[PDB]
């Protein structure tokens, strides 16, 4: 199924019939970072399998729901169960849920992910406000927009220079300062590694030479689809490890260590994003 | 349809029956840079849709013609309507028209494109004679030659060290000096960004570190297919903007600004390439 | 056909019925470097076309056999006729023979390849023990593991930091010292160029900046599939040329020069790997 105007419209019509919520804000949460979705007020849960034209996610399994409701007095829509390109999903499958958000009225998209640290200042448990990216799949002819352009949504050749909104970054930092955890918050450039193997030690050393601060396997495809159709983005990485220190010391990484860092920071991240939602313009 | 010897032969046979021209020179022109095609003498226009085994271009639409005729007393064939890989065309679709040129007798291919400047010496409106390239799709398993080798056309493992002919570069520069616009002409290395998003600010900074002078979304696939089958190439970029200055100043880019630069330089480029065609060995 | 547990099991069952060999060691040899396979004792030759679920290799042609038998008193299985991703084989086709090795009992995989030298210390005819890699296809969403994870074989997110076993590297070096050819043996980082074009002169200069020692078009996909399922790896490059010197001097390369270097070093490499097999733990 193509992520075109007709197919996105059919999905949006179903959601409006079931939900009664017109959301202004969309959220996509990283693994182990989804507690906020469970606290959405007056919520409505819509399994992806119920929605016309949503991608099929049964080969990978696990949860897959849209959740609509209220947080801090604002109307929101969340993806619970994220689609990643290393799983084999196509460009069209990644893009269709974001374009449905657009048709439902979303103007701001908030995103979190787990990432490896490249900048020497970064420690396990730190946060990075993403200010730009290096898209290795895009340079190499696997951009999420390869294919015919869907002109109803945006232009053939988008400019990404303002993909990461400056004022949203400033608001996130302001809340951290108000609550005395600004020492955990950095800004940086995110490198997209298609995955699913972690960056090798010598790949990490290369990324340090090229001016990357963090590296991960998500986020950039959704940012590009949002920017193409005029949705503002805030994206925050939680640092699982420093890959440069690990390379210099011959130390390993695994999904278990990543998820333990996620559990340590989950409650703070939930509170931070609730406050951002409450206050964003 | 595969870009093999039998399929290219059927297309070439049709063209020879309709056209009566055996061309020595092929041209592919960048967007807004096609005026020369409209001045071809004794011309014959052959829509792609009429030619056996030519790729289907109706999803993207717009013009798609082969034009044969004379320029400066030389016999030429032009592609009017270029195929780009960010549109979703396959390796085989890009390659078949160049291999048909080979079977028609083409020995030299002249190419223009619009590009972003990375080298700090480059200004909007400058020209760059391409002397080499950095092929990010090729390094990343999306080379135009991935697939079975078509042995009738060239070798399994081509060498690209002489893909950009030195004497053709010298002749282009000589004509610029004769007519007092050599101050606009540079030489440089072209980075292939698969696209269709413009290079991000942080991607531009990376390309500066890696020794690239210009960046764009075309040209390298056609150069590789031509080199594989023994066709000499001259490739010239028109600089739409300096992406490094734009990153340092927080300034944006769009297809409209690009096309305005193309209109400013269109007549000079037409005259330059007419003179190159007249004089090349 | 997917490289899953059921499909690999059917292939392994056929091989055990025909062969009577349970191998501990697997080998994959570079082009012109396969003499050792011809010296396997008490050997059994099984064409790929005879084995359930093995990939179809008739479009490319040439040899394609599994060979089982004894070398130096150890039980081995060799791939005679290597599958390369520049030929158009999919992720699943590359992976299935390595996963069949796993099910047959292989614990160690030995690999050779032909490569271009980037480090200035490297000369034609030198050997490089690979200690790490830079996987441009992997960074760019063409990793061999893109797709559903086959959980019976390994984890969703593998760590590659110990993909190249340290003790196997030490043993290879020890044998070279015992026989007075250690002056030919280096260690280094391997860059994977998807191919099939040789690295361009300006790509070679980029790889020098990024800390690569050698560049080639194979090996990394098989290393990743082996590491994912717990097989230890030794990988050795034979240097055909120095691509940096060739770029500075305007000198070319071709498959013929590569194969002449292979013929010069073939007998030494056969003797070296026979001794490694005899002595590895
Ligand atoms: Cl991350 C964060 C965000 C907000 C607070 C806070 C201090 S007072 C108060 N009334 C409701 C929220 N709130 C603390 C931490
Ligand atoms: Cl780009 C260019 C190329 C040629 C000329 C020129 C000066 S005299 C003359 N007779 C015909 C062409 N021609 C000027 C500019
Ligand atoms: Cl590459 C290599 C490997 C081994 C030797 C060697 C010296 S004595 C001896 N008995 C059998 C093998 N062998 C020489 C060269």
Using a CB–CB cutoff of 8 Å, tell me whether A112 touches chain C: no
B54 lines ligand 2 (CB under 6 A): no
| Token output for C180 | 């007075």
**Which CA distances in Å does B4 have to A141, B147, B150?**
23, 12, 6
For the residues of C88-129, what is the DSSP string, one character each?
Answer: T--HHHHHHHHHHHHHHT--EEEEEEEEEE-STT--TT-EEE
* Domain that includes residue B92, residue range: 1-281
The enclosing domain of B275 has a CATH number of: 3.40.50.1580
- From the CB of B127, is ligand 2 less than 6 Å away? no
8-state DSSP, B182: G
Residues with Cβ within 8 Å of A219's Cβ and at least 6 positions away in sequence, in order, are A111, A113, A130, A190, A192, A235, A237
Residue among B193, B246, B247 minimizing CB distance to A139: B193
Judged by a CB distance cut-off of 8 A, whether residue C253 touches chain B is yes
Give the CA diameter of chain A.
Answer: 56
Angle, CA B214 vertex, CA B208 and CA B215 arms, to 5°: 95
β pairing state of C74-80 and C25-28: parallel
**What is the rounded radius of gyration, in angstroms, for the C-alpha atoms of chain B?**
18
- Find, among B169, B161, B162, the residue nearest to B188 by Cα: B169
C24: tokens are 């501990």
Phi/psi of residue B254, nearest 5 degrees: -165, 160
Which of B130, B154, B161, B192 is the best residue to mutate to test the C interface, defined by the most C CB atoms within 10 Å of its own CB?
B161
> Measuring CA to CA, how many Å separate C76 from each of B49, C37, C102?
56, 10, 12
Cβ distance B158 to C60 less than 8 Å, yes or no, reads no
CB contacts < 8 A, B to C, total 105
Query: Is A32 exposed, middle or buried (CB count within 10 Å of its CB: 0-12, 13-18, 19+)?
Result: buried
| C166 has a chain A CB within 8 A of its CB | no
Nearest to C41 by CA among C78, C65, C70: C70
- How many alpha carbons fall within 13 Å on the CB side of residue C88? 17
Residue C265, judged by CB atoms within 10 A of its CB (0-12, 13-18, 19+), counts as buried
- The answer to whether B11 and B92 have CB atoms below 8 angstroms apart is no
Interchain CB distance below 8 Å, B138 and C194: yes
Q: Which of B107, B90, B78 is nearest to B273 (CA)?
A: B78
Burial of A151 (0-12, 13-18, 19+ CB in 10 A): exposed
Number of Cβ atoms within 10 Å of the Cβ of B179: 12
Burial of B180 (0-12, 13-18, 19+ CB in 10 A): exposed
Q: Could you tell me where the DSSP H helices lie in A89-239?
A: 91-104, 136-139, 166-178, 201-209, 220-228
Cα angle for residues B233, B234, B236 (degrees, 5° grid)? 140
How far away, in angstroms, is C271 Cα from ligand 3 center?
A: 7
Q: Count, in order, helices (H) and strands (E) of chain B.
A: 9, 9
List of chains touching B (3+ CB pairs within 8 A) = A, C
Rounded to 10 degrees, what is the CA torsion of B245, B246, B250, B252? 170
Comparing C-alpha atoms, which of A76, A75, A67 is closest to residue A38?
A67
What is the Cα–Cα distance from B279 to B228, expressed in whole angstroms? 25
Elucidation method: X-ray
Q: For atom 14 of ligand 1, which residue has the closest CA?
A: A179
The answer to whether the CB of B273 is under 6 A from ligand 2 is: no
CA distances from C3 to B186, C53, C156 (A): 51, 9, 15
- Which residues, including other chains, have CB under 8 Å from residue B83's CB and lie 6 or more apart? B55, B57, B89, B93, B94, B97
Cα–Cα distances in angstroms (integers) from residue B141 to residues B112, C87, C158, in the given order = 25, 10, 21
Token code pair at residue A187: 């800004």
Q: What's the token pair of residue A167?
A: 């004022």
CA-CA-CA-CA torsion sign (C90, C96, C101, C105) = positive
Q: C200: burial class by Cβ within 10 Å (0-12, 13-18, 19+)? A: buried
A136 interaction partners in chain C (CB closer than 8 Å): 136, 139-141
Number of folded domains that form chain A:
1
Q: What is the DSSP letter of A121?
A: T
Query: Taking CA A138 as the corner, what is the angle to CA B257 and CA A166, rounded to the nearest 5 degrees?
Result: 65
Q: Minimal Cα distance from C146: which residue of A?
A: A86
Is-cis flag, bond preceding B196, omega within 30? yes
């Amino acid at each position: 199924v193509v992520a075109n105007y007709e197919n996105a419209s059919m999905a949006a019509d179903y959601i409006k019939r079931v939900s009664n919520v017109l959301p202004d804000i969309g959220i996509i949460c990283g693994s182990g970072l989804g507690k906020l979705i469970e606290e959405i007020e007056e919520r409505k849960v819509i399994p992806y399998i119920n929605i016309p034209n949503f991608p099929k996610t049964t080969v990978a399994g696990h949860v897959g729901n849209l959740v609509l409701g209220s947080v801090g007095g604002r109307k929101i829509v969340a993806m619970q169960g994220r689609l990643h390109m290393y799983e084999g999903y196509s460009n069209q499958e990644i893009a269709l849920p974001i374009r449905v958000m657009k048709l439902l009225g979303v103007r701001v998209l908030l995103i979190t992910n787990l990432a490896g640290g490249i900048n020497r200042k970064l420690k396990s448990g730190d946060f990075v406000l993403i200010k730009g990216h290096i898209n290795f799949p895009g340079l190499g002819l696997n951009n999420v927009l390869v294919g015919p352009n869907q002109d109803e949504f945006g232009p053939r050749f988008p400019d990404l220079s303002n993909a990461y909104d400056r004022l949203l970054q400033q608001l996130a930092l302001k809340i951290a300062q108000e609550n005395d955890f600004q020492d955990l918050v950095h800004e940086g450039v995110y490198a997209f590694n298609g995955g699913p193997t972690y960056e090798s030690p010598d790949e990490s050393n290369m990324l340090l030479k090229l001016g990357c601060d963090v590296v991960g396997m998500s986020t950039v495809p959704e940012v590009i689809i949002a920017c193409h159709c005029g949705i503002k983005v805030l994206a925050v990485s939680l640092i699982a490890n420093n890959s440069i220190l690990d390379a210099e010391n011959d130390v390993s990484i695994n999904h278990e260590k990543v998820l333990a860092v996620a559990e340590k920071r989950a409650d703070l991240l939930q509170m931070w994003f609730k406050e951002i939602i409450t206050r964003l313009p």
